[PDB]
Design a protein around this ligand. Structure first.
Ligand SMILES: NS(=O)(=O)c1ccc(NC(=O)Cc2ccccc2)cc1
Ligand SMILES: [Zn+2]
Length: 257
């Protein structure tokens, strides 16, 4: 099965998922000097006040904090988007070292980690239908650098002991994802894909310019998770990122000058 190792990692994915070599794959390098300001972009609207988190799951590739997406409770709108996109889960990608771990890069710079807040377009009724549409998903990407702690991340860090291995879940209610956002909502946007198999070309990417800072102790706790199941040989869940893919016939737009 696919993963992030030498024998099943990103260079192999195309054999089971030929769209890996498609026309709108993610992540990409964001060349800041080549992105163009688009004055018609609207400000983002992040409306997370009624968010209902339910559960945290180690799925063997990352950990997901899942939300109740059966009503408009935590939604993303505006920016490049038409319509209302409901938050279904967030997760991270991270490195074995502070010098790598993000999926997107900025002028070839890699961050220590990257947060993905995954949303789907309510016009398609459910997530499984949305991933089959070119405008089905909107993923809000936020870079993490190592420095000061992010207080709003700590509740996530402290539950990780309970979901160390693949297939473990834990109750995770009343978590407020607003505590994971930076001050500014300035962003870059482009059309792309899921960054893991099945690599579907269904995502409007919205990547914030301002990173959040997390502490060394916080990211070290991410690196204690396991890709394996309980009772299987231990392999640390680190370097669960896909490298930058060719931009091809796309322009990255910026919301700011
Ligand atoms: N790293 S990312 O945010 O691009 C990203 C976000 C989500 C997924 N996968 C699913 O959510 C699972 C699924 C896929 C297809 C159909 C039903 C379920 C992979 C990558
Ligand atoms: Zn992701």
């Amino acid at each position: 099965h696919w993963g992030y190792g030498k024998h099943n990692g990103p260079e192999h994915w195309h054999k089971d998922f030929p769209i890996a070599k498609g026309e709108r794959q993610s992540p990409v390098d964001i060349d800041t000097h080549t992105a163009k300001y688009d004055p018609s972009l609207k400000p983002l609207s992040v409306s997370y006040d009624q968010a209902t988190s339910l559960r945290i799951l180690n799925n063997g590739h990352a950990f997901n904090v899942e939300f109740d997406d059966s009503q408009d409770k935590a939604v993303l709108k505006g920016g490049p988007l038409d319509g209302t996109y409901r938050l279904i889960q967030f997760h991270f990608h991270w490195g074995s070292l502070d010098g790598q771990g993000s999926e997107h890069t900025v002028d070839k710079k890699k961050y220590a980690a990257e947060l993905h807040l995954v949303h789907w377009n309510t016009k398609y009724g459910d997530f499984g239908k949305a991933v089959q549409q070119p405008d089905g998903l909107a993923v809000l990407g936020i870079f993490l650098k190592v420095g000061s702690a992010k207080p709003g991340l700590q509740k996530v860090v402290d539950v990780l002991d309970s979901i160390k291995t693949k297939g473990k879940s834990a109750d995770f209610t009343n978590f407020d994802p607003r505590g994971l956002l930076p001050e500014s909502l300035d962003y870059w946007t482009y059309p792309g894909s899921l960054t893991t198999p099945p690599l579907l070309e269904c995502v409007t990417w919205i990547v914030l310019k301002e990173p959040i800072s997390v502490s060394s102790e916080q990211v070290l706790k991410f690196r204690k998770l396991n890709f394996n199941g309980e009772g299987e040989p231990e392999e640390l869940m680190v370097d669960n990122w896909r490298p930058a893919q060719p931009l091809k016939n796309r322009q990255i737009k910026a919301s700011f000058k």
